[PDB]
Amino acid sequence: DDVIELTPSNFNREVIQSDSLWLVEFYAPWCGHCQRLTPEWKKAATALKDVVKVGAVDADKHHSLGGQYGVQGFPTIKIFGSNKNRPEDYQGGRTGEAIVDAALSALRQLVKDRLG
Q: Is residue 24 in some structural domain?
A: yes
- Please state how this structure was obtained: X-ray
CA quadruple 85, 91, 96, 101: dihedral sign: negative
- Residue 2 among the catalytic residues: no
Question: 47 near 80, Cβ under 8 Å?
Answer: no
Q: Under 8 Å CB-to-CB from 49, ≥6 apart: which residues?
A: 2
Torsion angles phi and psi, residue 66, rounded to 5: -60, -40
Q: How far apart are CA 73 and CA 10, in angstroms?
A: 23
- Number of domains within the chain: 1
Residue 116 within any structural domain of the chain: no
In a domain, 104, yes or no: yes
> Are 7 and 57 in contact, with CB atoms under 8 Å apart?
yes
Specify the CATH number for the domain of residue 99: 3.40.30.10
- For every residue of the chain, DSSP letters joined together read --PEE--TTTHIIIIIT-SS-EEEEEE-TT-HHHHHHHHHHHHHHHHTTTTSEEEEEETTTTHHHHHHTT--SSSEEEEE-SSTTS-EEE-S-SSHHHHHHHHHHHHHHHHHHHH-
Among candidate residues 104, 96, 105, the one with its CA nearest the CA of residue 37: 96
53 part of the active site: no
| Catalytic pick among 31, 47, 98, 104 | 31
User: Of 23, 34, 59, 99, which residue is the catalytic one?
Assistant: 34
- For 35, the domain range is 1-111
